[PDB]
Amino acid sequence: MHIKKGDNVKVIAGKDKGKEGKVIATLPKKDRVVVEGVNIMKKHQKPTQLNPEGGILETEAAIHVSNVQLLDPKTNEPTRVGYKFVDGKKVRIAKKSGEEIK
Amino acid sequence: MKAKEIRDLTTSEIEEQIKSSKEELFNLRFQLATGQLEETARIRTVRKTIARLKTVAREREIEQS
Amino acid sequence: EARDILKRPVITEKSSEAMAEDKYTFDVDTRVNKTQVKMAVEEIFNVKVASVNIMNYKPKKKRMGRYQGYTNKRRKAIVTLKEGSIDLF
Amino acid sequence: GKQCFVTGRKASTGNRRSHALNSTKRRWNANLQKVRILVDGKPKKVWVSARALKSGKVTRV
RNA sequence: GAGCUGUAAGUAAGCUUUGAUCCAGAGAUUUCCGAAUGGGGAAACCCAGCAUGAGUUAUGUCAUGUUAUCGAUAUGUGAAUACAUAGCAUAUCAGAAGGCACACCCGGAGAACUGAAACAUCUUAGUACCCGGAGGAAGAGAAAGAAAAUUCGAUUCCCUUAGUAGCGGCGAGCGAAACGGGAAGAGCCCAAACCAACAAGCUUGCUUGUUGGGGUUGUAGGACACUCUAUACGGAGUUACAAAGGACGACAUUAGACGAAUCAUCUGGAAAGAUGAAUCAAAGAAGGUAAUAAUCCUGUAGUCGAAAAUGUUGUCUCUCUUGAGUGGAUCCUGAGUACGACGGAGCACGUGAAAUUCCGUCGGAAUCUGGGAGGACCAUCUCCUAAGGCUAAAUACUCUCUAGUGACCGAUAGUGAACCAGUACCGUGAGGGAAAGGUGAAAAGCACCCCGGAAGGGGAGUGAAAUAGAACCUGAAACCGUGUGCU
RNA sequence: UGAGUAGCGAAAGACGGGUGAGAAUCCCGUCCACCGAUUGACUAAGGUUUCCAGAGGAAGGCUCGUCCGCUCUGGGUUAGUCGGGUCCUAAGCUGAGGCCGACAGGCGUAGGCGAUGGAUAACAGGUUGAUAUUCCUGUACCACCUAUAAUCGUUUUAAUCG
RNA sequence: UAGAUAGAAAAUAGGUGCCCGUACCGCAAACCGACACAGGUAGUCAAGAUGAGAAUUCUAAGGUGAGCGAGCGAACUCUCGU
Ligand SMILES: [Mg+2]
Ligand SMILES: [Mg+2]
Ligand SMILES: [Mg+2]
Ligand SMILES: [Mg+2]
Ligand SMILES: [Mg+2]
Ligand SMILES: [Mg+2]
Ligand SMILES: [Mg+2]
Ligand SMILES: [Mg+2]
Ligand SMILES: [Mg+2]
Ligand SMILES: [Mg+2]
Ligand SMILES: [Mg+2]
Ligand SMILES: [Mg+2]
Ligand SMILES: [Mg+2]
Ligand SMILES: [Mg+2]
Ligand SMILES: [Mg+2]
Ligand SMILES: [Mg+2]
Ligand SMILES: [Mg+2]
Ligand SMILES: [Mg+2]
Ligand SMILES: [Mg+2]
Ligand SMILES: [Mg+2]
Ligand SMILES: [Mg+2]
Ligand SMILES: [Mg+2]
Ligand SMILES: [Mg+2]
Ligand SMILES: [Mg+2]
Ligand SMILES: [Mg+2]
Ligand SMILES: [Mg+2]
Ligand SMILES: [Mg+2]
Ligand SMILES: [Mg+2]
Ligand SMILES: [Mg+2]
Ligand SMILES: [Mg+2]
Ligand SMILES: [Mg+2]
Ligand SMILES: [Mg+2]
Ligand SMILES: [Mg+2]
Ligand SMILES: [Mg+2]
């Protein structure tokens, strides 16, 4: 996927449209990503499980990867990504500024 | 153990390594049966090591011909 | 090939009683004979084997959900030691 | 599996026909005869058709 | 190029930028049954011989290799029976076997219901079924052809001729071909005469046989004699025309890489919708994304890419190889053949006036001044040159793979099978043969409280919705209940 | 719909005490009754885990169910001598070559296979929840192997094998 | 017997001896009958009283009370007694 674990991304679709966060996990086989503070779900946790204390746990649920967009390193605007070859190595380039992302 | 180290080894050394790996695998299976094996991934690791040793030995006895 | 002849020890109430009598129970390769089992035991555990009894167990029907199948057939040997002992633990 | 050893002459199939042109299957068999000839330089009793035997073209020995 | 140890969640233990998983080429391993092949056997099992080896004091036990039958080629031995012929024994062989794509091809053998308003000739039909043999195609094929002019020039296939000419209890029905228009095209090798070498009979005459050369036909050709021409100059080639290779190059297939361009607000759980203003386009195919997206993702147009294997090709190499003319003295030019009679069959053609072609049985030619054909037959004329062989393409089909398409189906449809289906189930067996799809955008799959043994429920909570809570989208009708206005 | 209708598949139960949310139906006890050339004890086919222990009560069980040949979990079958194979053959099957036959294939010799028959060495006791002529105890027997051997033989043999 | 070969072994001691089956039902609720079905299923053992007996009736060894019951005690049907 064009998004990678550790990237700083902007949500462009969903309830959290406009939020920014860090990509903390990816699911390549589902085309999904997990972004901090985004898509919070309240799951009913049984205290009877291996964890003694239970209740309602709040955690990020995965979002479809086409709903997050990389932020331009210079302008901090959402941008699509291209690829260059520098000394035979692929480099991700922001299509708005042309700068290397990572 | 990987194929590069195995290829560094000599044929007699490969045979001895196969013997010791088989003994280790057997001991692991016995521990698993008696319920004393927590590190279950060791079984697969040793099995694949044995497979690699045999693969290299077969390569050598093929290139000899 | 001894380590292939012997597959695993059998740990059950009946097997523990046998162990009290100096009889050790193993699941063995379904193709081997009593003599091969004796030789494998003597090679692996450095004991002297007094005798070997052996028996076969049919595949047993087993169910999981809507899927019907069978367990593997088994060959089980009971090795009576003449000299020495085997520690399975 | 019966045929002339020399020529392969063998039976054929066709129809017996009545005066009302009813048809029934029949065979025409070769006129085979068991004769001793030279096969691979050795005598051997084989089936040979009368026509293959005609005019002494086959040596009986 | 950052995750991964399948469905398939879980837990556990682990792996991975020192490049996992994953994708493609190549290789290694690949138990047992099965043609199954050491022998046996109620498939997936049992029991051996031999050699070598492991182990034991030794036996018992084990490992590896090998041992079926038939065929062919060699070697040895060799009966009745002398000679040697059966036979027997050994060795070699990537020799055969068996399977299937319910297709297409060729061949052996070959129905019936049925139609004829009954039925026998006839039809169904040389169809179905069975059997054998293949091949990627097969079959056919370079005139003993078609014809009747200014003749054409192998075969196959399409159009047309034409439902014509004909066949037919002249009933039902069966039903051409040549010409003309097209696809595709390609031509060749033997037998014989004769020559040389070798071997047997030993006229040790020259007869026979083998090998090589020579030769291939209708405008008659060839041998034979003679005259030119060349020892690969040229020409040809593994698709026939003889048969194996090698080097280099190109292209293609089997993974991949890059790849333009959108923001805002409104509604809403969510925007791709609406509104406003922009942008790309050799890209407005398509799918996905929380509703309907050229510009969010995967892609598309376009361009690039291969360590390795495979395929098709080009050039070199390699291999093979003479090519024409004149003469008419002699010689050759496919025999139990052609053909005839009888009995069948096949020809659109049912025996007919029945040519043309095959089979069984019996009889049985001619030899270039020859022989066959032009639908009985004869004459004349005309066209051919049988009784030997080979041959690509145009044609048939689809188990399969790749990329696509549809005024084709949309869960009683479409495959029997959207789903763990040739399953469950039924049958001794051959064989017959189902039913069964949908939570939600996300599992966020209902913490906690309460009645209950549980099931089940009421709250609470998640969610836009639970009135989406597990065969969980919608939820008709039959049918079953509770309440009630009028009766 | 018929309809809460027909049926609930040969029979003798009663009570007490347990267990349980719940008991005519489960467990234990006493009494009673039934079969007893047998409803008892073995065992060949056939079935194929139904066997044992613990747990369960949706469905199956013609009622009920706390129970079960049901469901879950984990167990259980031990052989030189028992039966079969490493022995034999019968009917029958198969069948190298062979004979026959459009194909397919049929028949058949030698040879094989093939028990329902022939041959063939282990008995008593004890023991578990579940195996026992199989495990254990005691005491046997059969074949083979190795070492030592009273004794006999030592190349026409003469002991020995056959 | 044809053949074979220097060696043979009464005894003593020690050792070796594989594969398959083995559970459970088996006149049955586990087999054949679609059923926890009044049918069918080879062979073996089979005590006492009575008796000719493996008949008869009652018992033993051993097993069993049958997978709907409670009442009532009409017609009618069935099976039985007078
Ligand atoms: Mg046993
Ligand atoms: Mg075999
Ligand atoms: Mg008719
Ligand atoms: Mg009619
Ligand atoms: Mg052809
Ligand atoms: Mg008439
Ligand atoms: Mg002419
Ligand atoms: Mg060629
Ligand atoms: Mg891209
Ligand atoms: Mg794009
Ligand atoms: Mg928008
Ligand atoms: Mg005729
Ligand atoms: Mg004519
Ligand atoms: Mg003629
Ligand atoms: Mg004419
Ligand atoms: Mg062709
Ligand atoms: Mg529907
Ligand atoms: Mg369907
Ligand atoms: Mg269907
Ligand atoms: Mg619904
Ligand atoms: Mg009532
Ligand atoms: Mg009524
Ligand atoms: Mg009534
Ligand atoms: Mg009633
Ligand atoms: Mg009853
Ligand atoms: Mg039980
Ligand atoms: Mg009930
Ligand atoms: Mg044969
Ligand atoms: Mg018997
Ligand atoms: Mg028992
Ligand atoms: Mg038993
Ligand atoms: Mg038993
Ligand atoms: Mg009877
Ligand atoms: Mg009686």
CSV table of N, CA and C in Angstrom, one decimal, chain C residues 31-85:
chain,number,residue,atom,x,y,z
C,31,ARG,N,4.3,-49.4,10.9
C,31,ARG,CA,4.9,-50.4,10.0
C,31,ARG,C,5.9,-51.3,10.7
C,32,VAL,N,6.3,-51.0,11.9
C,32,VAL,CA,7.4,-51.8,12.6
C,32,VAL,C,6.9,-53.0,13.3
C,33,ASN,N,7.8,-53.9,13.6
C,33,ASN,CA,7.5,-55.1,14.3
C,33,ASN,C,8.1,-55.0,15.7
C,34,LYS,N,7.6,-55.9,16.5
C,34,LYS,CA,8.0,-56.1,17.9
C,34,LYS,C,9.5,-56.1,18.1
C,35,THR,N,10.2,-56.8,17.3
C,35,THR,CA,11.7,-56.9,17.4
C,35,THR,C,12.3,-55.5,17.1
C,36,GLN,N,11.8,-54.8,16.1
C,36,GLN,CA,12.4,-53.5,15.9
C,36,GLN,C,12.1,-52.5,17.0
C,37,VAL,N,11.0,-52.6,17.7
C,37,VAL,CA,10.7,-51.8,18.8
C,37,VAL,C,11.7,-52.1,19.9
C,38,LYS,N,11.9,-53.4,20.2
C,38,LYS,CA,12.8,-53.8,21.3
C,38,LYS,C,14.2,-53.2,21.0
C,39,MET,N,14.7,-53.3,19.7
C,39,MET,CA,16.0,-52.8,19.4
C,39,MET,C,16.1,-51.3,19.5
C,40,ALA,N,15.1,-50.6,19.1
C,40,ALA,CA,15.1,-49.2,19.2
C,40,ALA,C,15.1,-48.7,20.7
C,41,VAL,N,14.3,-49.4,21.5
C,41,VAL,CA,14.3,-49.1,23.0
C,41,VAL,C,15.7,-49.3,23.6
C,42,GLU,N,16.3,-50.4,23.3
C,42,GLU,CA,17.6,-50.7,23.8
C,42,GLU,C,18.7,-49.7,23.3
C,43,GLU,N,18.6,-49.3,22.1
C,43,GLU,CA,19.5,-48.3,21.5
C,43,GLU,C,19.3,-46.9,22.2
C,44,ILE,N,18.1,-46.5,22.4
C,44,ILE,CA,17.8,-45.1,22.8
C,44,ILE,C,18.0,-44.9,24.3
C,45,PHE,N,17.6,-45.9,25.1
C,45,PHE,CA,17.5,-45.7,26.5
C,45,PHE,C,18.5,-46.5,27.3
C,46,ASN,N,19.4,-47.3,26.6
C,46,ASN,CA,20.5,-48.0,27.2
C,46,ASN,C,20.0,-48.9,28.4
C,47,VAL,N,18.9,-49.6,28.1
C,47,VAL,CA,18.3,-50.6,29.0
C,47,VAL,C,18.4,-51.9,28.4
C,48,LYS,N,18.0,-53.0,29.1
C,48,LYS,CA,17.9,-54.3,28.6
C,48,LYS,C,16.4,-54.6,28.6
C,49,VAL,N,15.8,-55.0,27.5
C,49,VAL,CA,14.4,-55.2,27.3
C,49,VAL,C,14.1,-56.7,27.5
C,50,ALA,N,13.2,-57.0,28.5
C,50,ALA,CA,12.8,-58.4,28.7
C,50,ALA,C,11.8,-58.8,27.7
C,51,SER,N,10.8,-58.0,27.3
C,51,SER,CA,9.9,-58.5,26.3
C,51,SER,C,9.1,-57.3,25.7
C,52,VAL,N,8.4,-57.5,24.6
C,52,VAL,CA,7.6,-56.5,24.0
C,52,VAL,C,6.3,-57.1,23.6
C,53,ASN,N,5.2,-56.5,24.1
C,53,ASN,CA,3.9,-56.7,23.6
C,53,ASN,C,3.4,-55.6,22.7
C,54,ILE,N,2.6,-55.9,21.7
C,54,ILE,CA,2.3,-54.9,20.7
C,54,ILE,C,0.8,-55.1,20.3
C,55,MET,N,0.2,-54.0,19.9
C,55,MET,CA,-1.2,-54.1,19.5
C,55,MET,C,-1.5,-53.0,18.5
C,56,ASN,N,-2.6,-53.1,17.8
C,56,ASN,CA,-3.1,-52.1,16.9
C,56,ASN,C,-4.4,-51.5,17.3
C,57,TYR,N,-4.6,-50.2,17.0
C,57,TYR,CA,-5.8,-49.5,17.3
C,57,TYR,C,-6.4,-48.9,16.0
C,58,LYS,N,-7.6,-49.3,15.7
C,58,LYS,CA,-8.3,-48.8,14.5
C,58,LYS,C,-8.4,-47.3,14.5
C,59,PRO,N,-8.6,-46.7,13.3
C,59,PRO,CA,-9.0,-45.3,13.3
C,59,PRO,C,-10.4,-45.2,14.0
C,60,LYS,N,-10.5,-44.1,14.8
C,60,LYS,CA,-11.7,-43.9,15.6
C,60,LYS,C,-12.5,-42.7,15.0
C,61,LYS,N,-13.8,-43.0,14.7
C,61,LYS,CA,-14.6,-41.9,14.2
C,61,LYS,C,-14.6,-40.7,15.2
C,62,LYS,N,-14.5,-39.5,14.6
C,62,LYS,CA,-14.4,-38.3,15.4
C,62,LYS,C,-15.1,-37.2,14.6
C,63,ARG,N,-15.8,-36.3,15.4
C,63,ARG,CA,-16.6,-35.2,14.8
C,63,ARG,C,-16.1,-33.9,15.3
C,64,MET,N,-16.2,-32.9,14.4
C,64,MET,CA,-15.9,-31.5,14.8
C,64,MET,C,-16.8,-30.6,14.0
C,65,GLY,N,-17.9,-30.2,14.5
C,65,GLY,CA,-18.9,-29.4,13.8
C,65,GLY,C,-19.7,-30.3,12.8
C,66,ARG,N,-19.7,-29.9,11.6
C,66,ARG,CA,-20.4,-30.7,10.6
C,66,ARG,C,-19.5,-31.6,9.8
C,67,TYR,N,-18.2,-31.7,10.2
C,67,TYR,CA,-17.2,-32.5,9.5
C,67,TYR,C,-17.0,-33.8,10.3
C,68,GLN,N,-17.2,-34.9,9.5
C,68,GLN,CA,-16.9,-36.2,10.1
C,68,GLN,C,-15.6,-36.8,9.5
C,69,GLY,N,-14.9,-37.4,10.4
C,69,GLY,CA,-13.6,-38.0,10.0
C,69,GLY,C,-13.2,-39.1,10.9
C,70,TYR,N,-11.9,-39.3,10.9
C,70,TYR,CA,-11.3,-40.4,11.7
C,70,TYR,C,-9.9,-39.9,12.3
C,71,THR,N,-9.6,-40.4,13.4
C,71,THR,CA,-8.3,-40.3,14.0
C,71,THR,C,-7.3,-41.2,13.2
C,72,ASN,N,-6.0,-41.0,13.4
C,72,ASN,CA,-5.0,-41.9,12.8
C,72,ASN,C,-5.1,-43.2,13.5
C,73,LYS,N,-4.9,-44.3,12.7
C,73,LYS,CA,-4.7,-45.6,13.3
C,73,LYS,C,-3.4,-45.5,14.1
C,74,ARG,N,-3.3,-46.4,15.2
C,74,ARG,CA,-2.2,-46.3,16.1
C,74,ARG,C,-1.6,-47.8,16.2
C,75,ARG,N,-0.3,-47.8,16.5
C,75,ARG,CA,0.3,-49.1,16.9
C,75,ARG,C,1.0,-48.8,18.2
C,76,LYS,N,0.6,-49.5,19.3
C,76,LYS,CA,1.0,-49.3,20.6
C,76,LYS,C,1.8,-50.5,21.2
C,77,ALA,N,3.0,-50.2,21.7
C,77,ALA,CA,3.8,-51.3,22.2
C,77,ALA,C,4.0,-51.0,23.7
C,78,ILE,N,4.2,-52.1,24.4
C,78,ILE,CA,4.4,-52.2,25.9
C,78,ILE,C,5.7,-52.9,26.1
C,79,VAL,N,6.8,-52.3,26.5
C,79,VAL,CA,8.1,-52.8,26.6
C,79,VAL,C,8.4,-53.1,28.1
C,80,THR,N,8.6,-54.4,28.4
C,80,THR,CA,9.0,-54.8,29.8
C,80,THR,C,10.5,-54.9,29.9
C,81,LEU,N,11.0,-54.0,30.7
C,81,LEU,CA,12.5,-53.9,30.9
C,81,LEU,C,13.0,-55.1,31.8
C,82,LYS,N,14.1,-55.6,31.5
C,82,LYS,CA,14.8,-56.6,32.3
C,82,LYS,C,15.8,-55.9,33.3
C,83,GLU,N,16.6,-55.0,32.8
C,83,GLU,CA,17.5,-54.2,33.6
C,83,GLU,C,17.4,-52.7,33.2
C,84,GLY,N,17.5,-51.9,34.3
C,84,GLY,CA,17.5,-50.5,34.1
C,84,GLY,C,16.1,-49.9,34.2
C,85,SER,N,16.1,-48.6,33.9
C,85,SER,CA,14.8,-47.8,34.0
C,85,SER,C,14.8,-46.7,33.0
